[PDB]
Amino acid sequence: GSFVEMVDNLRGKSGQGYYVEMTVGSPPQTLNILVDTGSSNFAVGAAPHPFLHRYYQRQLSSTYRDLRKGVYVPYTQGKWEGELGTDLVSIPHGPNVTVRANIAAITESDKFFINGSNWEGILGLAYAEIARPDDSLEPFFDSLVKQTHVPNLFSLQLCGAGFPLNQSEVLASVGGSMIIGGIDHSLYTGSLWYTPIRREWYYEVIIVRVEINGQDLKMDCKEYNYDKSIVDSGTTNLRLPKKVFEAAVKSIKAASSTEKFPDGFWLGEQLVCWQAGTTPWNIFPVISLYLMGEVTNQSFRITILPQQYLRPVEDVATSQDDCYKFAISQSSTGTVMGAVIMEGFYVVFDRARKRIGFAVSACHVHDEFRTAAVEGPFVTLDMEDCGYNI
Numbered sequence: 001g002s003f004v005e006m007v008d009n010l011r012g013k014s015g016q017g018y019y020v021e022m023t024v025g026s027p028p029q030t031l032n033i034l035v036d037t038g039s040s041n042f043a044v045g046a047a048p049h050p051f052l053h054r055y056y057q058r059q060l061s062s063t064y065r066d067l068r069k070g071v072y073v074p075y076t077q078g079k080w081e082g083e084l085g086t087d088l089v090s091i092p093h094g095p096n097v098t099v100r101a102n103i104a105a106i107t108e109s110d111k112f113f114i115n116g117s118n119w120e121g122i123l124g125l126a127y128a129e130i131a132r133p134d135d136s137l138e139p140f141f142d143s144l145v146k147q148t149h150v151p152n153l154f155s156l157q158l159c160g161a162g163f164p165l166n167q168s169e170v171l172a173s174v175g176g177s178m179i180i181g182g183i184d185h186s187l188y189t190g191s192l193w194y195t196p197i198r199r200e201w202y203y204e205v206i207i208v209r210v211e212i213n214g215q216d217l218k219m220d221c222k223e224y225n226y227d228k229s230i231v232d233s234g235t236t237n238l239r240l241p242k243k244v245f246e247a248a249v250k251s252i253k254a255a256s257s258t259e260k261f262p263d264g265f266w267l268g269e270q271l272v273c274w275q276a277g278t279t280p281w282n283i284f285p286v287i288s289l290y291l292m293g294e295v296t297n298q299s300f301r302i303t304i305l306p307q308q309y310l311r312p313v314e315d316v317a318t319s320q321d322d323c324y325k326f327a328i329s330q331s332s333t334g335t336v337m338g339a340v341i342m343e344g345f346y347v348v349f350d351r352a353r354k355r356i357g358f359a360v361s362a363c364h365v366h367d368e369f370r371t372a373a374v375e376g377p378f379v380t381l382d383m384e385d386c387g388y389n390i
């Protein structure tokens, strides 16, 4: 492990997000910032909000520069709005550099901040193409690489605890690592396998085959990537296109048929509980996603356990039962490999070589009988046809 200063610099959990400490302005203002590979703006709370105990105070920063431009960011379940500017930014448990970066000072929001998440802003790590208002607003990572000698690569080890963390525990617990400019070999086991970044906007990838307990879902592979497949630390669940979700849920139900679960469970709305320590992991299947390899006609697979796709939640009665929600849900916007999937792996965002690496995480939750896996190669034909075109 050659990046000790950055190891264990994340906190949080899949449901509320994983965050890294950052500083903004002169003198430095410390904020906790959501690590989001699914967006491209660096945006921070800059006005009082009921869910924020701190926020960016531009009037207190001598290095603040006003860009005299507003930004309006609506998304499916809410929105944020703010004022654009630039300031000096650092990552205390990061590279030892300070950069001048764009900052959207959030002045108004709806269902953006999450009560008790402990973060006050978001770090959009994807590409300029999806930055708001447009691609002229340089993302943080682009600024960092341009201004310093930091290599154009970052890697994420998101560590799910495998059980619920209360308010005190989640603040005191290590949630993982964000390695800026490198790969830390202590964070994974086995080999790193790489899939191409199809296009630089979201971190888009191509899924070529899906299995549930080794059984091929047998859908036309274009369905798996309709209308895109992305790697997103800012999404909790593994989200699948409607038809893929319907086929996967049918297969997962069939594999786990020895126990009947309510419709609300499969809809990802309701929790299910078992007496302490009796979760029947073995009845649930493993899920393998095959990804396009770097070599022509070659693929590899990543395999997750129910310890990844069943998200630990506290019981309504804070009982001694072990409870979970089903963290696979449908999408009308393509596949999303969210935090519950990323929790199984060390994920290398190799922007320099336009590729994403996956290896079994040193912190993935498993049992004595099964582990997550990253394996290959497999001979896979016409993988280009798996990609969707509008």
Ligand SMILES: CN1C(=N)NC(c2ccccc2)(c2ccccc2)C1=O
Pocket: 034, 036, 037, 038, 039, 073, 074, 075, 076, 111, 112, 113, 122, 232, 233, 234, 235
């Ligand atoms: C799926 N997803 C995401 N990865 N980041 C969010 C986002 C952020 C900025 C602009 C559009 C979407 C997000 C993250 C945290 C809270 C709210 C929204 C979002 O909705």
